[PDB]
């Protein structure tokens, strides 16, 4: 999986990890922390993960679990290909059966950069 450093951009580092990218942060205050709503915007462009808590259910078709544990985000590799369907999968409450399928396309670095730059008012950027 991926366990980021504990700096304020930790959740953005997870979103980048799941899309084959890295980020640089100029400082990310707690009001600008990555939350589930921002993570969902990234999910919509590459629906490969469930956001949850430790012990929480992961969509059987998720490639990753992005886990928020006491205000720290990390990523665990899951057992699916990354073929999630919609917000129910994102939240881990879907009725999916594990399916085979082509590996998922990551969000492009430039597209992810624009989302992160806007969400953090310029403070977090994709490398």
């Amino acid at each position: 999986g991926y366990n980021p450093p504990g700096d304020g951009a930790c959740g953005y580092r997870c979103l980048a990890f799941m899309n084959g990218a890295t980020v640089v942060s100029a400082g990310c205050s707690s009001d600008l922390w990555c939350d589930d709503e921002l993570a969902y915007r990234v999910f919509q462009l590459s629906p490969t993960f469930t956001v949850t808590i430790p012990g929480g259910r992961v969509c059987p078709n998720a490639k990753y679990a992005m886990i928020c544990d006491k205000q720290h985000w990390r990523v665990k590799r899951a057992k699916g290909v990354g073929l999630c369907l919609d917000e129910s999968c994102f939240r881990g409450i879907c009725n999916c059966q594990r399916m085979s399928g082509p590996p998922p396309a990551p969000v492009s670095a430039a597209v992810l950069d624009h989302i992160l730059e806007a969400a953090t008012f310029g403070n977090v950027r994709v490398v």
């Binding site: 922390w33 928020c68 985000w73």
Partner: protein, 76 residues
């Protein structure tokens, strides 16, 4: 009447409610049992997120209905 709330770990919570209870009140009942602040709770029924000022009856949530509890999360 009783309703059920399924949590992300698969735990089921049983709540004592009335049809006129507001979603806000239901969230406070969930806090009583699970310790999750209401502002972090997202309640889902019939695929829809329930809004705080509405009542259970507004969503036709009847006895022995099951809701899903998902969470706002931030962090780292």
């Amino acid at each position: 009447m009783q309703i059920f709330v399924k949590t992300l770990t698969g735990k089921t919570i049983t709540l004592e409610v009335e049809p006129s209870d507001t979603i806000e009140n239901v969230k406070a009942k969930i806090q009583d049992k699970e310790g999750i602040p209401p502002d972090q709770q997202r309640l889902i029924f019939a695929g829809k997120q329930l809004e705080d000022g509405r009542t259970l009856s507004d969503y036709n949530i009847q006895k022995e209905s099951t809701l899903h509890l998902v969470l706002r999360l931030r962090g780292x």
